[PDB]
Amino acid sequence: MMVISEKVRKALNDQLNREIYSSYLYLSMATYFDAEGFKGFAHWMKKQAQEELTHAMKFYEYIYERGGRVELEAIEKPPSNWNGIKDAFEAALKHEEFVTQSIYNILELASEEKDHATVSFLKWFVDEQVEEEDQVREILDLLEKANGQMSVIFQLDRYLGQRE
Amino acid sequence: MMVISEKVRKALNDQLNREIYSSYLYLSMATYFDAEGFKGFAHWMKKQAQEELTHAMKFYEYIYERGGRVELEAIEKPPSNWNGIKDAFEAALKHEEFVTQSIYNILELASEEKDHATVSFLKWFVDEQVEEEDQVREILDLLEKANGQMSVIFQLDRYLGQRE
Amino acid sequence: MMVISEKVRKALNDQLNREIYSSYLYLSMATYFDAEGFKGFAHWMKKQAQEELTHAMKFYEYIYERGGRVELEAIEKPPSNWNGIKDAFEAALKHEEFVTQSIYNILELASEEKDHATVSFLKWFVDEQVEEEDQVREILDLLEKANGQMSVIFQLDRYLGQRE
Amino acid sequence: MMVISEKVRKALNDQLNREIYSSYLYLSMATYFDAEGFKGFAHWMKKQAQEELTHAMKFYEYIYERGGRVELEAIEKPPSNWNGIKDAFEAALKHEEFVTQSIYNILELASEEKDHATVSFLKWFVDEQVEEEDQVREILDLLEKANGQMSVIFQLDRYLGQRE
Amino acid sequence: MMVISEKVRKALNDQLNREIYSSYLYLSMATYFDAEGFKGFAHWMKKQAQEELTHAMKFYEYIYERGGRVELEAIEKPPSNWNGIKDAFEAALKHEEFVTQSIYNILELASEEKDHATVSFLKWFVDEQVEEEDQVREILDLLEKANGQMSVIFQLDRYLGQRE
Amino acid sequence: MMVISEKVRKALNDQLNREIYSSYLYLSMATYFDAEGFKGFAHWMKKQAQEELTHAMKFYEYIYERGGRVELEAIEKPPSNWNGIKDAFEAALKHEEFVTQSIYNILELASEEKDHATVSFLKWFVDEQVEEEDQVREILDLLEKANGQMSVIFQLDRYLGQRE
Ligand SMILES: [Fe+3]
Ligand SMILES: [Fe+3]
Ligand SMILES: [Fe+3]
Ligand SMILES: [Fe+3]
Ligand SMILES: [Fe+3]
Ligand SMILES: [Fe+3]
């Protein structure tokens, strides 16, 4: 039997599908960067795409642990182009902030229903989001300082390309 | 410059998107097996999904290697209910044979264009598809013999759950 | 001096005595499985009883850490017979869900008094209960599928008898 | 089929229930010592409680080896306060002497019925009780010599707190 | 941009400054124990001072992770004398209990604002405060028993002198 | 009995308090660097803060060795903002030169009193100050040759961020 409410299960399943899209978005960002000749930034992006899939799978497994099931939905076509390296990371930041609020919304729902199990489950993602958001801010800081000097982009492309 | 034709690039890009769908389909099968309580079968499908992403990425990197660009498209909602275990693996077989034929179509397009580089590149996938098809046929034969007997199905689930 | 309220101390002390009873219940189930000749299912229950004792001792030590004292109460006689293996596990699931509600009630009490220390301490048990319920549900679902088939029950007894 | 008589089975099951009570009593002594701030003496009592459970389980397994079954009974509420350290260890000594006589009584019953298997089984307990009683008498001797001197009691608490 | 509200940033920054003062208060207790010839108690306080700096640095880094900034404020002159060993440790407990309440107030502010990230972040401190308080209470219990007997105070000085 | 003069004790205690302020000043410089997004310069400043505390503790311990006592004083609020990276390191150099003269004044005081123990003790700090001043001058040299070029400033930030 399912021990989560249908509302909570729906919220969790919706969030699973959002992490799938997050993954796919970051893959397309990789497509952009590769097309611009920045293999390091693209490498970063491929690595992030994989990280998002681990988030999806954490939701996946918790749904089953509470006796629900997952239903996968259509994935929307992401953007494939950005107006420059900074434009893409600003998009990444705004996406991650949106994911954080989505998670927050599930937390508040669960808390309202006195579903302490789901509330506790979500702590991990609250904490991870802090780091996801921070990593993109740091990159934007470094890009802001670089002011388009290939010299610096070459080392910072190199640097993000050493990820993992 | 791009040194594949736009027709070939499009064919390869379409197949990249097909492999992403394959990955998602196998994940959907995993959602089914997990809902039905077969974690071994679900495990096998999760590994298979991961494998399909590696195929997608081989297409990805070849496209850039020949000067082209990748454009990610919408992914269709996969089916989530099968009549039973054997029906889900039968659908997997059918899907792999469809992918094989998709690959054959690119290969024939490339040989027509004398794009020997792309022809040589696809050989890996022709060979890999033979193995992919064979693995599912083997499971199907076991499941035909089990003839719905739970005791045998349980053994198969445990064995497929050992997939590395 | 005691830094928890007497209301929260009593709630914690009550839960400690409930975890002792849990332990005893599982030992009782081991008596039943051993009477029926299922040494592997009995082993599992013995290990489960020991696990419940570690939960009791976690409450014990937290009560003292907040300046309170533990008072052990009488332990009720558990049932000692069930209507087969599946019935025993059904009872075990109902007991665990009852334990989860008991933890929830303490959590809600402590929250209402702003006893953040106790709220935080109780997170571990919320998370543990998710796993405990899930382990029983997994066993039940296997048993549902087995439909009393002795070959499947033998293999399950062997597997549960491996529990560390 | 049960090879022990119902009378010997009842005596063995009674004694298993008595050993469970012994465990619970020593845990209660630990609650007292922890309340008084003697964590070493409390640790000694927790280890003793664990030891008593091993005794219960030795009775358990022999009952099943002879084709009988265990029925767990309610556990009486133990005392939770003593007049001082000596008072608590004196209560432990008295309890152990009572357990020794309880085992003697089973031995005498088994011997009257010519149940040589059960007589032989009980030798381990006769021997173990010698050591159990001696251990408490040793501690009492040292407490008698300490005569309320805290330098000496600190050392004793520390030592008993190293019990493996 | 700063993710945290200015009210929450202020609260966290004020606490960082409180933890710096805690550090310095414990160094001051070391200066007292060193003046009294208790190098072990002084060692303990030097270790506790170092621990409080790790706390401050945890706030520090969280503030920057949320896009805020730290401002270091003047540090008040701590007391430099106590009326005896117990007196100093009683002052340490009162201080720690004040620190716990300060933390609780941040947590309640953050919860009111639905700043789930900061609420989550503070759990570590709620748990750590339980242990900080407990360790000083334990010391105070021992000192109470020692009751000014120098042979027992020597024992405790050597013990606390072994803090790593 | 104290075998340093009260004048020398007071000068040494003043200097211990000056080293504490040095520590705090470097932590404040770290707050600025972190606010400006230079985590490597911020790391170096944190490590510098820690080193200054080791200096304070060397004064601390010598004072106790000569039979004196340490009295901790209020610590002034440090500046938190500079006009750029070079401005901060110039302010660090100026501070260290001031600390050097502070040490020199104690040395001269101790010499006038024929306190050869204290003169000798202070030689360590004379030599260390030569090295602390050189450390900062080297960095200021590297910042001058960077000449505002971000490529180079990033190599220096990462490098100073390796400090152990
Ligand atoms: Fe994510
Ligand atoms: Fe494929
Ligand atoms: Fe439990
Ligand atoms: Fe015993
Ligand atoms: Fe602290
Ligand atoms: Fe210094």
PDB file of C-alpha atoms in Angstrom, chain B:
ATOM      1  CA  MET B   1      33.949  23.586 -41.225  1.00  0.00           C
ATOM      2  CA  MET B   2      31.432  20.727 -41.215  1.00  0.00           C
ATOM      3  CA  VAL B   3      32.772  17.781 -43.236  1.00  0.00           C
ATOM      4  CA  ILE B   4      29.645  15.617 -43.065  1.00  0.00           C
ATOM      5  CA  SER B   5      26.688  16.518 -45.296  1.00  0.00           C
ATOM      6  CA  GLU B   6      23.669  18.116 -43.671  1.00  0.00           C
ATOM      7  CA  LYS B   7      21.681  15.006 -44.633  1.00  0.00           C
ATOM      8  CA  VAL B   8      24.166  12.832 -42.736  1.00  0.00           C
ATOM      9  CA  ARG B   9      24.364  15.228 -39.797  1.00  0.00           C
ATOM     10  CA  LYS B  10      20.574  15.216 -39.555  1.00  0.00           C
ATOM     11  CA  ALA B  11      20.452  11.397 -39.698  1.00  0.00           C
ATOM     12  CA  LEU B  12      23.070  11.160 -36.935  1.00  0.00           C
ATOM     13  CA  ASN B  13      21.336  13.835 -34.821  1.00  0.00           C
ATOM     14  CA  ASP B  14      17.989  12.060 -35.203  1.00  0.00           C
ATOM     15  CA  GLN B  15      19.622   8.814 -34.003  1.00  0.00           C
ATOM     16  CA  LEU B  16      21.206  10.622 -31.060  1.00  0.00           C
ATOM     17  CA  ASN B  17      17.648  11.697 -30.088  1.00  0.00           C
ATOM     18  CA  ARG B  18      16.403   8.094 -30.673  1.00  0.00           C
ATOM     19  CA  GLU B  19      19.010   6.763 -28.240  1.00  0.00           C
ATOM     20  CA  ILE B  20      17.894   9.302 -25.624  1.00  0.00           C
ATOM     21  CA  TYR B  21      14.344   8.030 -26.058  1.00  0.00           C
ATOM     22  CA  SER B  22      15.655   4.415 -25.755  1.00  0.00           C
ATOM     23  CA  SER B  23      17.267   5.318 -22.444  1.00  0.00           C
ATOM     24  CA  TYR B  24      13.979   6.867 -21.248  1.00  0.00           C
ATOM     25  CA  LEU B  25      11.952   3.875 -22.431  1.00  0.00           C
ATOM     26  CA  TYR B  26      14.156   1.463 -20.439  1.00  0.00           C
ATOM     27  CA  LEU B  27      13.810   3.696 -17.403  1.00  0.00           C
ATOM     28  CA  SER B  28      10.037   3.506 -17.898  1.00  0.00           C
ATOM     29  CA  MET B  29      10.282  -0.282 -17.989  1.00  0.00           C
ATOM     30  CA  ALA B  30      12.183  -0.041 -14.707  1.00  0.00           C
ATOM     31  CA  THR B  31       9.238   1.996 -13.281  1.00  0.00           C
ATOM     32  CA  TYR B  32       6.935  -0.867 -14.304  1.00  0.00           C
ATOM     33  CA  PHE B  33       9.128  -3.683 -12.870  1.00  0.00           C
ATOM     34  CA  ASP B  34       9.546  -1.762  -9.619  1.00  0.00           C
ATOM     35  CA  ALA B  35       5.771  -1.174  -9.384  1.00  0.00           C
ATOM     36  CA  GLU B  36       5.319  -4.916  -9.925  1.00  0.00           C
ATOM     37  CA  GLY B  37       7.943  -5.745  -7.232  1.00  0.00           C
ATOM     38  CA  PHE B  38      10.761  -7.119  -9.416  1.00  0.00           C
ATOM     39  CA  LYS B  39      13.801  -5.130  -8.380  1.00  0.00           C
ATOM     40  CA  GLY B  40      16.186  -7.356 -10.333  1.00  0.00           C
ATOM     41  CA  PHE B  41      14.417  -6.753 -13.618  1.00  0.00           C
ATOM     42  CA  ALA B  42      14.147  -3.055 -12.638  1.00  0.00           C
ATOM     43  CA  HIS B  43      17.927  -3.046 -11.949  1.00  0.00           C
ATOM     44  CA  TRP B  44      18.652  -4.574 -15.357  1.00  0.00           C
ATOM     45  CA  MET B  45      16.559  -1.850 -17.040  1.00  0.00           C
ATOM     46  CA  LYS B  46      18.304   0.928 -15.102  1.00  0.00           C
ATOM     47  CA  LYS B  47      21.714  -0.383 -16.297  1.00  0.00           C
ATOM     48  CA  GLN B  48      20.346  -0.709 -19.846  1.00  0.00           C
ATOM     49  CA  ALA B  49      19.176   2.962 -19.720  1.00  0.00           C
ATOM     50  CA  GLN B  50      22.697   4.015 -18.681  1.00  0.00           C
ATOM     51  CA  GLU B  51      24.133   2.000 -21.575  1.00  0.00           C
ATOM     52  CA  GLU B  52      21.817   3.735 -24.082  1.00  0.00           C
ATOM     53  CA  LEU B  53      23.141   7.118 -22.897  1.00  0.00           C
ATOM     54  CA  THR B  54      26.655   5.960 -23.746  1.00  0.00           C
ATOM     55  CA  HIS B  55      25.427   5.253 -27.299  1.00  0.00           C
ATOM     56  CA  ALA B  56      23.872   8.714 -27.455  1.00  0.00           C
ATOM     57  CA  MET B  57      27.158  10.218 -26.367  1.00  0.00           C
ATOM     58  CA  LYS B  58      29.158   8.286 -28.992  1.00  0.00           C
ATOM     59  CA  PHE B  59      26.872   9.852 -31.643  1.00  0.00           C
ATOM     60  CA  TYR B  60      27.264  13.208 -29.908  1.00  0.00           C
ATOM     61  CA  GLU B  61      31.073  13.157 -30.036  1.00  0.00           C
ATOM     62  CA  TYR B  62      31.291  11.888 -33.628  1.00  0.00           C
ATOM     63  CA  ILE B  63      29.040  14.724 -34.797  1.00  0.00           C
ATOM     64  CA  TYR B  64      31.413  17.343 -33.316  1.00  0.00           C
ATOM     65  CA  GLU B  65      34.443  15.368 -34.580  1.00  0.00           C
ATOM     66  CA  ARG B  66      33.142  15.930 -38.151  1.00  0.00           C
ATOM     67  CA  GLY B  67      32.402  19.647 -37.567  1.00  0.00           C
ATOM     68  CA  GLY B  68      28.670  19.410 -36.991  1.00  0.00           C
ATOM     69  CA  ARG B  69      26.475  20.397 -34.068  1.00  0.00           C
ATOM     70  CA  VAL B  70      23.895  18.492 -31.954  1.00  0.00           C
ATOM     71  CA  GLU B  71      20.341  19.761 -31.437  1.00  0.00           C
ATOM     72  CA  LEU B  72      18.303  18.013 -28.700  1.00  0.00           C
ATOM     73  CA  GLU B  73      14.575  17.533 -29.442  1.00  0.00           C
ATOM     74  CA  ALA B  74      11.494  16.859 -27.283  1.00  0.00           C
ATOM     75  CA  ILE B  75      11.304  13.357 -25.869  1.00  0.00           C
ATOM     76  CA  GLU B  76       7.970  11.564 -26.128  1.00  0.00           C
ATOM     77  CA  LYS B  77       6.271  10.137 -23.078  1.00  0.00           C
ATOM     78  CA  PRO B  78       7.075   6.435 -22.913  1.00  0.00           C
ATOM     79  CA  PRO B  79       4.526   3.705 -22.144  1.00  0.00           C
ATOM     80  CA  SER B  80       4.426   2.811 -18.441  1.00  0.00           C
ATOM     81  CA  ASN B  81       2.133  -0.303 -18.246  1.00  0.00           C
ATOM     82  CA  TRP B  82       2.865  -3.725 -19.818  1.00  0.00           C
ATOM     83  CA  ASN B  83       0.653  -6.841 -19.627  1.00  0.00           C
ATOM     84  CA  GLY B  84       3.389  -8.681 -17.787  1.00  0.00           C
ATOM     85  CA  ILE B  85       7.100  -9.347 -17.513  1.00  0.00           C
ATOM     86  CA  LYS B  86       7.515 -11.095 -20.842  1.00  0.00           C
ATOM     87  CA  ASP B  87       5.558  -8.359 -22.657  1.00  0.00           C
ATOM     88  CA  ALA B  88       7.961  -5.693 -21.389  1.00  0.00           C
ATOM     89  CA  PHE B  89      11.016  -7.671 -22.611  1.00  0.00           C
ATOM     90  CA  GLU B  90       9.234  -8.396 -25.926  1.00  0.00           C
ATOM     91  CA  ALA B  91       8.769  -4.613 -26.297  1.00  0.00           C
ATOM     92  CA  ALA B  92      12.473  -4.143 -25.573  1.00  0.00           C
ATOM     93  CA  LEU B  93      13.351  -6.612 -28.334  1.00  0.00           C
ATOM     94  CA  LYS B  94      11.017  -4.866 -30.756  1.00  0.00           C
ATOM     95  CA  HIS B  95      12.570  -1.501 -29.846  1.00  0.00           C
ATOM     96  CA  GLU B  96      16.130  -2.724 -30.327  1.00  0.00           C
ATOM     97  CA  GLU B  97      15.304  -4.158 -33.757  1.00  0.00           C
ATOM     98  CA  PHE B  98      13.797  -0.788 -34.681  1.00  0.00           C
ATOM     99  CA  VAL B  99      17.025   0.945 -33.533  1.00  0.00           C
ATOM    100  CA  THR B 100      19.054  -1.540 -35.579  1.00  0.00           C
ATOM    101  CA  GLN B 101      17.053  -0.676 -38.677  1.00  0.00           C
ATOM    102  CA  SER B 102      17.479   3.046 -37.903  1.00  0.00           C
ATOM    103  CA  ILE B 103      21.247   2.504 -37.803  1.00  0.00           C
ATOM    104  CA  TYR B 104      21.068   0.506 -41.083  1.00  0.00           C
ATOM    105  CA  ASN B 105      19.311   3.459 -42.712  1.00  0.00           C
ATOM    106  CA  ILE B 106      22.112   5.873 -41.737  1.00  0.00           C
ATOM    107  CA  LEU B 107      24.728   3.407 -42.934  1.00  0.00           C
ATOM    108  CA  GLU B 108      23.081   3.110 -46.323  1.00  0.00           C
ATOM    109  CA  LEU B 109      22.730   6.895 -46.574  1.00  0.00           C
ATOM    110  CA  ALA B 110      26.442   7.327 -45.814  1.00  0.00           C
ATOM    111  CA  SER B 111      27.585   4.638 -48.304  1.00  0.00           C
ATOM    112  CA  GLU B 112      25.404   6.309 -50.954  1.00  0.00           C
ATOM    113  CA  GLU B 113      27.200   9.622 -50.246  1.00  0.00           C
ATOM    114  CA  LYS B 114      30.625   7.876 -50.122  1.00  0.00           C
ATOM    115  CA  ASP B 115      31.026   9.116 -46.578  1.00  0.00           C
ATOM    116  CA  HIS B 116      33.366   6.206 -45.641  1.00  0.00           C
ATOM    117  CA  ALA B 117      34.199   7.791 -42.307  1.00  0.00           C
ATOM    118  CA  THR B 118      30.615   7.670 -41.134  1.00  0.00           C
ATOM    119  CA  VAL B 119      30.180   4.154 -42.571  1.00  0.00           C
ATOM    120  CA  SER B 120      33.263   2.868 -40.607  1.00  0.00           C
ATOM    121  CA  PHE B 121      31.997   4.688 -37.494  1.00  0.00           C
ATOM    122  CA  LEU B 122      28.577   2.904 -37.576  1.00  0.00           C
ATOM    123  CA  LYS B 123      30.141  -0.557 -37.685  1.00  0.00           C
ATOM    124  CA  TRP B 124      30.555  -0.482 -33.916  1.00  0.00           C
ATOM    125  CA  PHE B 125      26.794   0.031 -33.543  1.00  0.00           C
ATOM    126  CA  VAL B 126      25.882  -2.666 -36.060  1.00  0.00           C
ATOM    127  CA  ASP B 127      27.965  -5.130 -33.996  1.00  0.00           C
ATOM    128  CA  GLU B 128      26.687  -3.803 -30.672  1.00  0.00           C
ATOM    129  CA  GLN B 129      23.047  -4.155 -31.838  1.00  0.00           C
ATOM    130  CA  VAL B 130      23.578  -7.843 -32.641  1.00  0.00           C
ATOM    131  CA  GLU B 131      24.575  -8.307 -28.989  1.00  0.00           C
ATOM    132  CA  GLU B 132      21.787  -6.069 -27.619  1.00  0.00           C
ATOM    133  CA  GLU B 133      19.192  -8.048 -29.583  1.00  0.00           C
ATOM    134  CA  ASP B 134      20.698 -11.384 -28.552  1.00  0.00           C
ATOM    135  CA  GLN B 135      20.654 -10.545 -24.830  1.00  0.00           C
ATOM    136  CA  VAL B 136      16.934  -9.795 -24.904  1.00  0.00           C
ATOM    137  CA  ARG B 137      16.157 -12.900 -27.028  1.00  0.00           C
ATOM    138  CA  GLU B 138      17.929 -15.002 -24.428  1.00  0.00           C
ATOM    139  CA  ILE B 139      15.811 -13.566 -21.616  1.00  0.00           C
ATOM    140  CA  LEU B 140      12.642 -14.087 -23.688  1.00  0.00           C
ATOM    141  CA  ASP B 141      13.477 -17.766 -24.244  1.00  0.00           C
ATOM    142  CA  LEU B 142      13.922 -18.252 -20.510  1.00  0.00           C
ATOM    143  CA  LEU B 143      10.655 -16.474 -19.831  1.00  0.00           C
ATOM    144  CA  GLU B 144       8.810 -18.637 -22.453  1.00  0.00           C
ATOM    145  CA  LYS B 145      10.120 -21.734 -20.686  1.00  0.00           C
ATOM    146  CA  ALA B 146       9.198 -20.419 -17.217  1.00  0.00           C
ATOM    147  CA  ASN B 147       5.661 -20.164 -18.636  1.00  0.00           C
ATOM    148  CA  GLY B 148       4.545 -17.772 -15.895  1.00  0.00           C
ATOM    149  CA  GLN B 149       5.827 -19.953 -13.026  1.00  0.00           C
ATOM    150  CA  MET B 150       6.775 -17.597 -10.194  1.00  0.00           C
ATOM    151  CA  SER B 151       9.475 -19.815  -8.741  1.00  0.00           C
ATOM    152  CA  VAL B 152      11.381 -19.627 -12.015  1.00  0.00           C
ATOM    153  CA  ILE B 153      10.634 -15.933 -12.572  1.00  0.00           C
ATOM    154  CA  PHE B 154      12.138 -15.189  -9.098  1.00  0.00           C
ATOM    155  CA  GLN B 155      15.369 -16.900 -10.059  1.00  0.00           C
ATOM    156  CA  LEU B 156      15.597 -14.902 -13.278  1.00  0.00           C
ATOM    157  CA  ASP B 157      14.930 -11.600 -11.394  1.00  0.00           C
ATOM    158  CA  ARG B 158      17.788 -12.351  -8.962  1.00  0.00           C
ATOM    159  CA  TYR B 159      20.177 -13.229 -11.780  1.00  0.00           C
ATOM    160  CA  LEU B 160      19.346 -10.112 -13.864  1.00  0.00           C
ATOM    161  CA  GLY B 161      19.667  -8.014 -10.678  1.00  0.00           C
ATOM    162  CA  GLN B 162      23.378  -9.017 -10.633  1.00  0.00           C
ATOM    163  CA  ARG B 163      24.077  -7.074 -13.866  1.00  0.00           C
ATOM    164  CA  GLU B 164      27.238  -4.963 -13.512  1.00  0.00           C
TER     165      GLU B 164
END
